[PDB]
Amino acid sequence: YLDGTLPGDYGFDPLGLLDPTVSNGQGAGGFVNPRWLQYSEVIHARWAMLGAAGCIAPEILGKAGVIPAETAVDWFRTGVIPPAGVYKDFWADPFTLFFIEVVAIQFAELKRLQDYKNPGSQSRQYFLGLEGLFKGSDNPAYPGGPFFNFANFGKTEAEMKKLKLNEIKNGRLAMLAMFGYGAQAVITGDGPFDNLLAHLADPTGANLIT
Amino acid sequence: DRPLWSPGSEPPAWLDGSLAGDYGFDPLHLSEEPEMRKWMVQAELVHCRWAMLGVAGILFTSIGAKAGGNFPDWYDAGKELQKNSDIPLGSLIFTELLLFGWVETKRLYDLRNPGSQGDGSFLGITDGLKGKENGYPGGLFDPMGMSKNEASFKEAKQKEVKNGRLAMLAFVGFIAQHHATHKSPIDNLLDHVADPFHVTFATNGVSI
Amino acid sequence: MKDFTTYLSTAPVVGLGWAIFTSGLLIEINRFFPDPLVFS
Amino acid sequence: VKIAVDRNPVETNFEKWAKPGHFSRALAKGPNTTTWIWNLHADAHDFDNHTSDLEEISRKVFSAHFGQLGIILIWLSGMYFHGARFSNYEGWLSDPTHIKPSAQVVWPIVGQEILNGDVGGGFQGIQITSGFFQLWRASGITSELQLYSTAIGGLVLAAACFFAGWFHYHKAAPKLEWFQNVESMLNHHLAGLLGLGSLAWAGHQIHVSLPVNKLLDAGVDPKEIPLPHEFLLNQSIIADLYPSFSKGLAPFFTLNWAEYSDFLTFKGGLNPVTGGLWLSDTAHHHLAIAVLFLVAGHQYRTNWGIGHSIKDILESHKGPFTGNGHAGLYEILTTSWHAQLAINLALFGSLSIIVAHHMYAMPPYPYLATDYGTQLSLFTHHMWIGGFCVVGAGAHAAIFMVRDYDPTNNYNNLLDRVIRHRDAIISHLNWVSIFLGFHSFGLYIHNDTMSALGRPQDMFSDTAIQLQPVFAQWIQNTHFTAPQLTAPNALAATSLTWGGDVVAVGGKVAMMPIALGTSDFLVHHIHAFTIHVTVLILLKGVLFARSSRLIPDKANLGFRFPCDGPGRGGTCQVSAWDHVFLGLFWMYNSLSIVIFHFSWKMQSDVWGTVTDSGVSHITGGNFAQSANTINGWLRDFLWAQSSQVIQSYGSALSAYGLMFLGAHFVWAFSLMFLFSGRGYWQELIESIVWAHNKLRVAPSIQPRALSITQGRAVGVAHYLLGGIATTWSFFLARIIAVG
Ligand code: CLA
Numbered sequence A: 001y002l003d004g005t006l007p008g009d010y011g012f013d014p015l016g017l018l019d020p021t022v023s024n025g026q027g028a029g030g031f032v033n034p035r036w037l038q039y040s041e042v043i044h045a046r047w048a049m050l051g052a053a054g055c056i057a058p059e060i061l062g063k064a065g066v067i068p069a070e071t072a073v074d075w076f077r078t079g080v081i082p083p084a085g086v087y088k089d090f091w092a093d094p095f096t097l098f099f100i101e102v103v104a105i106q107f108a109e110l111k112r113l114q115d116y117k118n119p120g121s122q123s124r125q126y127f128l129g130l131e132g133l134f135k136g137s138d139n140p141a142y143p144g145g146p147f148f149n150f151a152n153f154g155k156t157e158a159e160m161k162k163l164k165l166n167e168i169k170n171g172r173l174a175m176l177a178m179f180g181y182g183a184q185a186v187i188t189g190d191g192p193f194d195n196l197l198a199h200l201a202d203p204t205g206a207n208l209i210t
Numbered sequence B: 001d002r003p004l005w006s007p008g009s010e011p012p013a014w015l016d017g018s019l020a021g022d023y024g025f026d027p028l029h030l031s032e033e034p035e036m037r038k039w040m041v042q043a044e045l046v047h048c049r050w051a052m053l054g055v056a057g058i059l060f061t062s063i064g065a066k067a068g069g070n071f072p073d074w075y076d077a078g079k080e081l082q083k084n085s086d087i088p089l090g091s092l093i094f095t096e097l098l099l100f101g102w103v104e105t106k107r108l109y110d111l112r113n114p115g116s117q118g119d120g121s122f123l124g125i126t127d128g129l130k131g132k133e134n135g136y137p138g139g140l141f142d143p144m145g146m147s148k149n150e151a152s153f154k155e156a157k158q159k160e161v162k163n164g165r166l167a168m169l170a171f172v173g174f175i176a177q178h179h180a181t182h183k184s185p186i187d188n189l190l191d192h193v194a195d196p197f198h199v200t201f202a203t204n205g206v207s208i
Numbered sequence C: 001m002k003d004f005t006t007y008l009s010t011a012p013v014v015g016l017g018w019a020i021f022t023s024g025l026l027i028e029i030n031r032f033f034p035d036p037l038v039f040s
Numbered sequence D: 001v002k003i004a005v006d007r008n009p010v011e012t013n014f015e016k017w018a019k020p021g022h023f024s025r026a027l028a029k030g031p032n033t034t035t036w037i038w039n040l041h042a043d044a045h046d047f048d049n050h051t052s053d054l055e056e057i058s059r060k061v062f063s064a065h066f067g068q069l070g071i072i073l074i075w076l077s078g079m080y081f082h083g084a085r086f087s088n089y090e091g092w093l094s095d096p097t098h099i100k101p102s103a104q105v106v107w108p109i110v111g112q113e114i115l116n117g118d119v120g121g122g123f124q125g126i127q128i129t130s131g132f133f134q135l136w137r138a139s140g141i142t143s144e145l146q147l148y149s150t151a152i153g154g155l156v157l158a159a160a161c162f163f164a165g166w167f168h169y170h171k172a173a174p175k176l177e178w179f180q181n182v183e184s185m186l187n188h189h190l191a192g193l194l195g196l197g198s199l200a201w202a203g204h205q206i207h208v209s210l211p212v213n214k215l216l217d218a219g220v221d222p223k224e225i226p227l228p229h230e231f232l233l234n235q236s237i238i239a240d241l242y243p244s245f246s247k248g249l250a251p252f253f254t255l256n257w258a259e260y261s262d263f264l265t266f267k268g269g270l271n272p273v274t275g276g277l278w279l280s281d282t283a284h285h286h287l288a289i290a291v292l293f294l295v296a297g298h299q300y301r302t303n304w305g306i307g308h309s310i311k312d313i314l315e316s317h318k319g320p321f322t323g324n325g326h327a328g329l330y331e332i333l334t335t336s337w338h339a340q341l342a343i344n345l346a347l348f349g350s351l352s353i354i355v356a357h358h359m360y361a362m363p364p365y366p367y368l369a370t371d372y373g374t375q376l377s378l379f380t381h382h383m384w385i386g387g388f389c390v391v392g393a394g395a396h397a398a399i400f401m402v403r404d405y406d407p408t409n410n411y412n413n414l415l416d417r418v419i420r421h422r423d424a425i426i427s428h429l430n431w432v433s434i435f436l437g438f439h440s441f442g443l444y445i446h447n448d449t450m451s452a453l454g455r456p457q458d459m460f461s462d463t464a465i466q467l468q469p470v471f472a473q474w475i476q477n478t479h480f481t482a483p484q485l486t487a488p489n490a491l492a493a494t495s496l497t498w499g500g501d502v503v504a505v506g507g508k509v510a511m512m513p514i515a516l517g518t519s520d521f522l523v524h525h526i527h528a529f530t531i532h533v534t535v536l537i538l539l540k541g542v543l544f545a546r547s548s549r550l551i552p553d554k555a556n557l558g559f560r561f562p563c564d565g566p567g568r569g570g571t572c573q574v575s576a577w578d579h580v581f582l583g584l585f586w587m588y589n590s591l592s593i594v595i596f597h598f599s600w601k602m603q604s605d606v607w608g609t610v611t612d613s614g615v616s617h618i619t620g621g622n623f624a625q626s627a628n629t630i631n632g633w634l635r636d637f638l639w640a641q642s643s644q645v646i647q648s649y650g651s652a653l654s655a656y657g658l659m660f661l662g663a664h665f666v667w668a669f670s671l672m673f674l675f676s677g678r679g680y681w682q683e684l685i686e687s688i689v690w691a692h693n694k695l696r697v698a699p700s701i702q703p704r705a706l707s708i709t710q711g712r713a714v715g716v717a718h719y720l721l722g723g724i725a726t727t728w729s730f731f732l733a734r735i736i737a738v739g
């Protein structure tokens, strides 16, 4: 059933979770279906594309002389998992920031979900004049618009398909990387860049086998 | 055709939009029947109007206490004012329960039967004391002619409800950030304005 | 809601409300004016 | 093999809540008699009778099972919560021997408060006998905050369970194909649930249950203990306790596992301090068990195409004497739920009976053997649960023969050949029951008659015509002398019941060798007599459910019917349902004896306070001499141990004295239902309806007497409840007031 029309189709579905036989009826139903799984693949990817860039950027810039070493700290010692460590000097405590985090994100998430449940619904109701930017599109993952694609890149359809899968190939790689950051940190107890600096120095001596 | 509490949600069938402060908010399917809907709009307004009347009493005293006047906290105010009063407790309660049973009962029978109290039995009053709508009387409770115009009466109903929902949320606030800080509401305000980043609900020692 | 109120009007549910009333009333009548035997 | 779901089959609304009886065609009409009410609560969960569709029956079952889990998880979270806020766990943890557990504080109303006994630890409440305190100590639990979180987790997971049942039924419900993927279910249930489940537990025991109970047993105060999470973070702390933790997984991946000998052990026996199993041994057990179930889960060929096929395995084990054997069973099991339920209940009940024997001799959780009320309550519970479950197999197997039995699939099969020599089964089994009851129970009467006549030399006893169980005695020594020869690396034996020395804890013995004699020979046989008969009643009902010589057509009458008629001399209680109704009384009688045996034996020969000069048992070791006579079981067990219950008025055990009487009332009350019949009652109601009619106060729902089948069910229910609740009062009051 994998025709290959999709961007990131390379014929790898051993378990058969994307088949159209499952969820035969019509309705909302369950999460496992082509409409939701395709949507969650890029969401995981984009969030991970941001995370893997940010988990290693302060450490790299810290080894370099640009950023102060006080701020340059391992991604797991910056406030998440306070047993690991906690940055004392922010402009507010973590829990105050979490209520900021939750609120400002709840808006963005719920609104996106509402868009998935009923397309174009968020433009119809007044939202502080920002309704023109949320018109959406046929597909729930690639809305586009005056903001999300403010610089219209793929005016041609063929150029979009090339970008639509470069978003995935560069993205599915990042998801693996963050899975490496978590596993590296537990065993090594050090940042991801310092672990790289060791394998380049003593590869045979610094390794998972060790 | 109008705003809603969650954009994109289909509003219920029974909430047409004529009522004041209608945003299609009833997931429990309450007020689905006409008779219960006729009862709840009157329950919402009294819970509102008592909130406005009460919360203003708390701000007036808590501000007068912060300025220097002799006013106590809204909490533990009935305990310190009864210690030194000529009116015992029990004579003050059943002066309130007995006097409200008159009003609260007359309001009930206007609900069950509109226009019933305007018969002229009570001291020969007929044109007043008959309801204009369910929870919106007039004549005597509207001395100023601020309701003899449907254009300016329909939006005033929207302001009575919007400043009311907000008001009875505030009373829940006073309960909550009293139990945490055991201070007045105004004192909690000046602290947040003094050091907004540091003094929040996270740093009160409670709720964590 | 018409069907919910009808479910609440069944026998198992109305009896549950009766039991909480009669038992709640008697236990409350023993908590205050404790352990009565003779009626004044 | 693949996933298959049908979207939004059923709408969710309260419309059918208002219309009871919707599931059945007969009940949807409405009530004109009061019999409609009893039929409603009865046929509610009989999904096979509602509809013929096997798919809908599967959707209903898979979603109802999600309910029992949510019902369990709030119950389980309640114990954790009630143990956190209304208990003495922190006090008991610091002085376990002297302080008693208490998780049920009572309110202050008329009377009542006296039940809040002086438990100890600055606390007063009801003394529990569930063993939760020893369970929470076997794991790393020192504070009440760990119990609160554990409770909030259950409510969260329980709502998820309940949500799942609505989701898996009302929104996205699987298809019949998803349910028949039986091979897939076995691999996931074996490897995933039992395998990883046990491997996970090992992790917790290794990182929390071992680093905490080592300090607690060394006298350290609980508040000074380092918290369960800190041990994971610091590899230096746990290394001080177990130095093997300093090497860190290199021994594992290099296959040098001898380094982990510090915490992975084969000690055997019991801890001298706690009177419980070595916690290091259990981590080794559950670790071992995971590797065993993991390989088992890679057996069936679900979708990869490599492995065994259940059908090919069944239709290949054939024999001459059997003919066509095991052939048409894969079609049965994949089509009828009652077949699987009967098989599952038989092993799920016989397992809880194994849990009861393998816990008392091998006390796993610490400070359990010294809490005799706890050790006696767990045994009596898991044993009763086994009897019910076993009897359910005989009921839920007869339903298969009546409803889900197609003779076309079964020709010269194992199931067909069993029916064709059924009269040989029941006949040969009838002879055994008569053989046992004479040679076993008749021995008891011989001892009674000999004693009353003044001929005690002629009794069956130790000082007498001894009948000693040589086979058991030989097995005790073999398992006792095993560490020398058959299990050299074993430091000691599995339990001290086989042989050895006493293990004393807090001045009380946890376990000591049990000696078997002439009395233990009669009782062990008495049990077989009660088991062979209980099988005769159920097995007879199964085979003769579909047809008999008296009634060649029972299957058309159905599973439960009272009687065909007063003809043939009488046909009342001929159905398979009425065989289950009879097996319950026997099953209850058999289980009760297996409980008296545990109480008098362990009180007299095992339990007691250890002094400088030996042990002083509770009943002075009277099981050997008195048990041989029936009057001994009346004098030394009943007329003696009933003193603590009777004299409970005016103390915290007063509730047991009431339940002791209340249980007798409900037991007798059942006799009205079993002895009489629905004819006398229906006529009496007519004379009552006249008075209610005379005053124009009469029900439109006509009153009708209870149905014959219901009358019998109502009897055995009030009968078992009163028979079982008496012991529940006669035991806990006896044992809590020790001796
Ligand atoms: C693209 C991702 C990525 C990258 C670039 C690295 C790179 C590195 N890792 Mg790392 N790691 C990763 C993923 C990654 N890892 C993942 C996913 C895990 C969890 C399994 C780990 C767990 C891990 C540990 C525990 C350690 C490292 C270490 C290291 C460093 C030395 C190499 C070594 O000895 O480990 C090689 C270890 C491996 C597990 C290599 C195989 C991982 C492959 C490349 C990615 C996964 C393939 C994927 C699962 C295939 C798809 C199948 C799936 C659909 C079923 C090096 C900088 C070591 C270190 O700190 O350096 C001193 C160290 O101790 N890693």
Ligand code: CLA
Pocket: D665, D666, D668, D669, D670, D671, D672, D673, D675, D676, D684
């Ligand atoms: C403990 C055993 C027991 C008990 C309690 C009873 C009780 C009763 N029998 Mg009876 N009976 C029994 C054994 C018993 N029988 C046996 C072994 C036989 C021979 C098989 C008979 C044969 C028999 C016959 C032929 C008749 C009776 C009748 C009666 C009733 C007579 C009227 C009366 O006394 O008012 C009531 C007496 C009471 C003790 C009240 C019982 C209920 C109490 C008050 C509990 C209250 C409920 C409480 C709230 C708990 C409810 C909770 C629960 C529902 C969850 C009576 C209720 C006669 C009858 O029909 O009455 C008109 C009648 O004709 N019996």
Ligand code: CLA
Pocket: C010, C011, C012, C015, C016, C019, D017, D020, D037
């Ligand atoms: C959840 C489990 C459950 C349980 C334990 C019961 C139990 C009962 N139901 Mg039932 N019910 C249930 C679920 C349940 N139901 C469900 C799911 C439905 C579908 C909506 C119904 C619908 C239903 C109907 C339509 C009826 C019952 C009736 C009854 C009662 C039988 C009549 C009787 O014997 O007393 C006989 C009573 C007298 C002779 C005189 C009246 C005095 C009574 C005893 C006082 C009231 C007792 C009170 C209800 C007890 C509290 C509830 C208790 C379970 C804790 C009985 C107590 C019948 C009833 O009338 O209820 C009382 C009845 O008509 N139920």
Ligand code: CLA
Pocket: D076, D129, D130, D131, D132, D134, D135, D347, D348, D351, D352, D355, D365, D378, D381, D382, D385
């Ligand atoms: C209404 C039924 C019922 C009830 C009310 C109880 C009540 C109780 N049980 Mg029990 N249990 C039952 C049925 C029941 N059980 C059955 C049928 C079995 C046979 C498997 C068991 C096996 C069992 C064991 C082994 C233990 C209890 C224990 C307890 C007591 C502590 C409660 C607890 O949370 O411990 C929680 C129990 C554990 C943390 C350990 C459970 C270990 C078992 C072996 C897990 C097996 C689960 C497995 C997946 C299901 C069987 C697989 C299948 C192939 C057979 C408590 C008094 C414990 C106790 O003695 O209290 C001190 C105890 O160790 N139960």
Ligand SMILES: CCCCCCCCCCCCCCCC(=O)OC[C@H](COP(=O)(O)OC[C@@H](O)CO)OC(=O)CCCCCCCCCCCCCCC
Pocket: D317, D318, D319, D320, D321, D322, D325, D326
């Ligand atoms: C617990 C001790 C119980 C022993 C006494 C019970 C005796 C009553 C059983 C008599 C039925 C005789 C008819 C056989 C029925 C029959 O003819 O079936 C035929 C069967 C041979 O089968 P085939 O090899 O031809 O076919 C097998 C295939 O059909 C597989 O499905 O016989 C046996 O299996 C031997 C059974 C001996 C049964 C007695 C032993 C049962 C207890 C198990 C332990 C025994 C050893 C204990 C010592 C430690």
